[PDB]
């Protein structure tokens, strides 16, 4: 497992998000493990 993904995923898990089905894992992967870029996409639901 990539430690840069584990760190970003754990930071976002503490924010209250889930990883049901791996949606948050896939999001951080498409956003280069950028939490700010991931949070911007989440806002644009």
């Amino acid at each position, epitope marked *: 497992a990539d430690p840069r993904l584990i760190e970003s995923l754990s*930071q976002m898990l*503490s*924010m*209250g998000f889930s990883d049901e089905g791996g949606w948050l894992t896939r999001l951080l992967q498409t956003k280069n493990y950028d*939490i*700010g*870029a991931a*949070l*911007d996409t*989440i*806002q644009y639901s």
Partner: nanobody, 115 residues
Framework: EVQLVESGGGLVQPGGSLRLSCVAS????????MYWVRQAPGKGLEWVSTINTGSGAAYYTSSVKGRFTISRDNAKNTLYLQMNSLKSEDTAVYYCATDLRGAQRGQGTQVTVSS
């Protein structure tokens, strides 16, 4: 129970600098993901920055990264947002919130950028 009081907004020139404060009470502020959100003219609430008051991890939206700086004073129960090189698009009512969408926010402070 939960109370959030913002302050520090005002009218500034393009490129000016401001610092917003937000006094929090009624919950565990010293270990919490605190947010700054803003409502642009005629727009909806959008997140600006977030920080975990326990660890210190800070994250910003793409349009403000490098220009804004979020911080906190756990001993003062205060959340800060240092704003530099302000643009016209930064004009908004700024709130501190306990969530990304700004559901539990304060009354907010006004930041207007005009030359």
């Amino acid at each position: 129970e939960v109370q959030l009081v913002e302050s520090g907004g005002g009218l500034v020139q393009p490129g000016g600098s401001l610092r917003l404060s937000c006094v929090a009470s009624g919950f565990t502020f010293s270990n919490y993901w605190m947010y700054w959100v803003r409502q642009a003219p005629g727009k909806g609430l959008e997140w600006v920055s977030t920080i975990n008051t326990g660890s210190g991890a800070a994250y910003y939206t793409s349009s403000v990264k490098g220009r804004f700086t979020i911080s906190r004073d756990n001993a003062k129960n205060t959340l800060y947002l240092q704003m530099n090189s302000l643009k016209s698009e930064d004009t908004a009512v700024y709130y501190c919130a306990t969530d990304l969408r700004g559901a539990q926010r304060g009354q907010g402070t006004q930041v207007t950028v005009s030359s």
